[PDB]
Design an enzyme around this catalytic site. Structure first.
Site, PDB file in Angstrom:
ATOM      1  N   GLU B  25       1.311  -1.665   0.288  1.00  0.00           N
ATOM      2  CA  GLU B  25       0.368   0.073   0.053  1.00  0.00           C
ATOM      3  C   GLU B  25       0.712   0.911  -0.278  1.00  0.00           C
ATOM      4  O   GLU B  25       0.963   2.378  -0.686  1.00  0.00           O
ATOM      5  CB  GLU B  25      -0.470  -0.397   1.137  1.00  0.00           C
ATOM      6  CG  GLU B  25      -1.886   1.094   1.377  1.00  0.00           C
ATOM      7  CD  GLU B  25      -2.278   1.382   2.710  1.00  0.00           C
ATOM      8  OE1 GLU B  25      -2.529   1.160   3.379  1.00  0.00           O
ATOM      9  OE2 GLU B  25      -1.982   3.331   2.469  1.00  0.00           O
ATOM     10  N   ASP B  52      -7.043   4.024   1.562  1.00  0.00           N
ATOM     11  CA  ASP B  52      -6.080   4.237   1.533  1.00  0.00           C
ATOM     12  C   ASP B  52      -5.428   5.304   1.179  1.00  0.00           C
ATOM     13  O   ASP B  52      -4.425   5.959   1.038  1.00  0.00           O
ATOM     14  CB  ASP B  52      -5.559   2.908   0.468  1.00  0.00           C
ATOM     15  CG  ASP B  52      -6.193   1.887   2.071  1.00  0.00           C
ATOM     16  OD1 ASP B  52      -5.888   1.773   2.538  1.00  0.00           O
ATOM     17  OD2 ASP B  52      -6.241   0.777   0.963  1.00  0.00           O
ATOM     18  N   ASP B  61      -8.637   2.464  -2.838  1.00  0.00           N
ATOM     19  CA  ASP B  61      -8.154   1.769  -1.940  1.00  0.00           C
ATOM     20  C   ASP B  61      -7.298   0.611  -2.162  1.00  0.00           C
ATOM     21  O   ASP B  61      -7.044   0.269  -3.420  1.00  0.00           O
ATOM     22  CB  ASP B  61      -9.022   0.529  -0.750  1.00  0.00           C
ATOM     23  CG  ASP B  61     -10.282   1.511   0.439  1.00  0.00           C
ATOM     24  OD1 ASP B  61      -9.466   2.812   0.166  1.00  0.00           O
ATOM     25  OD2 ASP B  61     -10.474   1.130   0.739  1.00  0.00           O
ATOM     26  N   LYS B  80     -15.089  -6.898  -1.964  1.00  0.00           N
ATOM     27  CA  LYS B  80     -14.539  -5.555  -0.856  1.00  0.00           C
ATOM     28  C   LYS B  80     -16.326  -4.433  -1.744  1.00  0.00           C
ATOM     29  O   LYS B  80     -15.979  -3.998  -0.916  1.00  0.00           O
ATOM     30  CB  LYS B  80     -13.326  -5.548  -1.889  1.00  0.00           C
ATOM     31  CG  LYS B  80     -12.112  -5.638  -0.981  1.00  0.00           C
ATOM     32  CD  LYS B  80     -10.957  -6.255  -2.175  1.00  0.00           C
ATOM     33  CE  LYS B  80      -9.734  -7.218  -1.141  1.00  0.00           C
ATOM     34  NZ  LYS B  80      -9.070  -6.168   0.016  1.00  0.00           N
TER      35      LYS B  80
END
Ligand SMILES: [Br-]
Ligand SMILES: [Br-]
EC number: 3.1.-.-
Lengths: 103, 132
Positions: B25, B52, B61, B80
């Site tokens: 990430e 994120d 994200d 998700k």
């Protein structure tokens, strides 16, 4: 974003009833640090993935890591979940890939 | 290109799996900022949810599949979105053997309800886009 994919052998309604007690028993984790989605009936795709890991799934729900600083509680959260579904089997896959549960 | 907001701090006790997802990430942010996107990490936003990034304004994200099962990757994204309320996804193929091409084909022959913009980063840092 980190998500625990949780498959259950029990039906949606019962699953949810059980999740209420969890939310009430672990307000610390489950108000903010982790977010628990509503439970749904597992469709064919989720049932397929659950069955590769031993389990016949009827319901499914998601647990999102909402506070990054709590990323180290995933294994304890996983255990809390296995235990609050006494009356049934649960498979937990982190991001639908990594098995956090036994067998 | 640009990069701001606080980058993600990985808790010491996190294991190899969790640690690797947080690494990827933080890495997707840098890779994109260097490709010309304006990236804000861990942006404040209204909902109970904490996305994120923000990529040129849009909440995004990161998802860093280790699996190579393209269908499962789609299934995962789909959920998700449906259960997690994700919309725009950065898909980072660092640890996956699934081709960017194959992901695009999959997401196209079976649209995923709710799904927003998808940005693919392949093993070499090449960006492809799959539009909503
Ligand atoms: Br750190
Ligand atoms: Br695989």
């Amino acid at each position: 974003a980190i998500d625990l994919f949780c498959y259950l052998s029990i039906d949606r309604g019962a699953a949810e009833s059980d999740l209420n007690k969890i939310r009430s028993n672990h307000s610390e984790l489950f108000e903010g640090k982790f977010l628990i989605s509503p439970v749904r009936d597992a469709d064919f795709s989720l049932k397929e993935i659950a069955a590769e890991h031993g389990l016949v799934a009827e319901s499914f729900f998601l647990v999102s890591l909402n506070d990054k600083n709590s990323a180290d509680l995933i294994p304890i959260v996983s255990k809390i979940l296995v235990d609050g579904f006494n009356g049934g089997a649960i498979l937990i896959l982190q991001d639908n890939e990594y098995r956090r549960t036994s067998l | 290109g640009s990069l701001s907001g606080k980058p993600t701090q990985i808790p010491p006790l996190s294991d190899e799996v969790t640690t690797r997802s947080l690494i990827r990430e933080n890495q997707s942010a840098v890779t994109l900022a260097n490709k010309g996107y304006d990236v804000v990490q861990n942006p404040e936003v209204l909902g109970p949810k904490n996305p994120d990034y923000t990529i040129n304004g849009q909440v995004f994200d990161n998802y860093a599949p280790a699996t190579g099962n393209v269908r499962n990757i789609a299934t995962t994204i789909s959920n998700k979105v449906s259960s997690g309320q994700a919309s725009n996804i950065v898909v980072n193929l660092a640890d996956s053997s699934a081709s960017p091409a194959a992901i695009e084909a999959q997401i196209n022959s079976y649209p995923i309800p709710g799904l927003g913009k998808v940005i693919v980063i392949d093993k070499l840092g090449n960006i492809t886009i799959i539009k909503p």
